[PDB]
Amino acid sequence: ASAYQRFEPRAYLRNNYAPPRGDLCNPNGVGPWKLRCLAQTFATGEVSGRTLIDIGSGPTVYQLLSACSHFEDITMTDFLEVNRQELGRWLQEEPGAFNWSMYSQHACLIEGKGECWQDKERQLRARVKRVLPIDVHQPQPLGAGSPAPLPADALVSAFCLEAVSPDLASFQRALDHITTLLRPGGHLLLIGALEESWYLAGEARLTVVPVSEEEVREALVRSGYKVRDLRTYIMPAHLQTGVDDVKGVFFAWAQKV
């Protein structure tokens, strides 16, 4: 856990959201794949409501681009101060903010409603009301009297749980911990790494639990979800880059039942 104390936001963004993993031009890469999963799911019309929470956002916003037009109250979270600070920089268009414009643009491309990427960002920034501390290990991940409208209509989380969990069972408990924040009938969009065991964030070396698709599936069941969709992306060689050892990325669409 203390390992996340060395976690460098910029190095993380560099390793994961700049080229080659950050090149959105090629349809076969992980970035486009994730954006595609998110967009397709929301285009169904079946994930809707007023409030949404993003569990373990880190310094990233890409995972809400398609989401932001189906929820007017959005809550972002992370365990580290530095990540929340980094988010603020983008939300407030402050100086030195990370540049997400390529991703906004591509979400506008994929969604295909003729939306300009500035409108897209504008809405996102508008609908994110708060950026809050959170610890999934706690049965009440958001603490007692959070300003977060509970329970949420929907949840999103990407590359968080498996990355904060020593083993399968901690991963299971965490899933249970965040699930409490989710209204019955609500939706969870879980994105994460397949069979990963470590990744680097500057001086920080983080341990990861290597999970399989079927493992992810069963965990969702055991947490009280009906799995609407589970797809896998296999990591091409050219995107195996020495920053981690992830083999693939899973996308899960689940519904609390």
Ligand X SMILES: Nc1ncnc2c1ncn2[C@@H]1O[C@H](CSCC[C@H](N)C(=O)O)[C@@H](O)[C@H]1O
Ligand Y SMILES: O=C(O)c1ccc[nH]c1=O
244 binds ligand Y (CB under 6 A): yes
Minimum distance of ligand Y from residue 29's CB (angstroms): 9
Of 41-49, 105-113, 155-163, 216-224, the segment contacting a copy of itself by CB under 8 A is 105-113
From the number of C-beta atoms within 10 Å of its C-beta (0-12, 13-18, 19+), residue 64 rates as: buried
Angle (CA) 145 148 149, round 5°: 105
78 touches, from ligand Y, ligand X, a copy of itself, none (C-beta below 5 to 8 Å by class): ligand X
When asked if residue 249 is in the footprint of ligand Y (CB under 6 A), the reply is yes
Q: What residues contact residue 26 under an 8 Å CB cut-off, 6+ apart?
A: 32
Contact call for residue 161 and ligand Y (CB under 6 A): no
Which chain residues interact with ligand X by CB under 6 A?
A: 4, 7, 16, 56-58, 60, 63, 78-80, 83, 134-137, 158-160, 163-164
What is the smallest separation between the CB atom of 50 and ligand Y, expressed in angstroms?
28
Contact partner, 193, from ligand Y, ligand X, a copy of itself, none, Cβ < 5-8 Å per class? ligand Y
Rounded CA-CA distance 60/63 in Å is 7
CA 13 to chain centre: 13
Cβ neighbours of residue 43 closer than 8 Å, sequence gap 6 or more: 66, 111
Asked if residues 147 and 132 have their Cβ atoms less than 8 Å apart, the reply is: yes
Among 108, 152, 211, 252, interactor with a copy of itself by CB under 8 A: 108
At its nearest, how many Å lie between ligand Y and the CB of residue 219? 18
Cβ proximity to a copy of itself: between 115 and 245 the closer is 115
Residue 53 host element (H or E): strand 51-55
Integer Cα distance of 154 and 256 in angstroms? 9
CB of 154 to ligand X, least distance (A): 15
Q: How far is the CB of 174 from ligand Y (least distance, A)?
A: 16
| CA-wise closest residue to 79 among 11, 153, 164 | 164
Pick from 193, 201, 206, 220 the residue near ligand Y by CB under 6 A: 193
Check residue 112 for interaction with a copy of itself (CB under 8 A).
Answer: yes
In the complex with ligand Y, the residue whose CB is nearer, 129 or 247, is 247
Question: Which amino acid does the sequence have at 12?
Answer: Y
153 is in an annotated binding site: no
Which H or E run contains 228?
strand 225-234
Flag whether 167 is marked binding: no
Q: What is the dihedral of CA 147, 151, 155, 157, to 10 degrees?
A: 50
What's the half-sphere exposure (Cβ side, CA atoms, 13 Å) at 244? 29
Stretch that binds a copy of itself, among 21-29, 48-56, 68-76, 159-167 (CB under 8 A): 21-29
Tell which one of 159, 171, 225, 250 touches ligand Y (CB under 6 A): 159
Enumerate the known binding-site residues.
12, 17, 56-57, 62, 78, 83, 135-136, 158, 196, 244
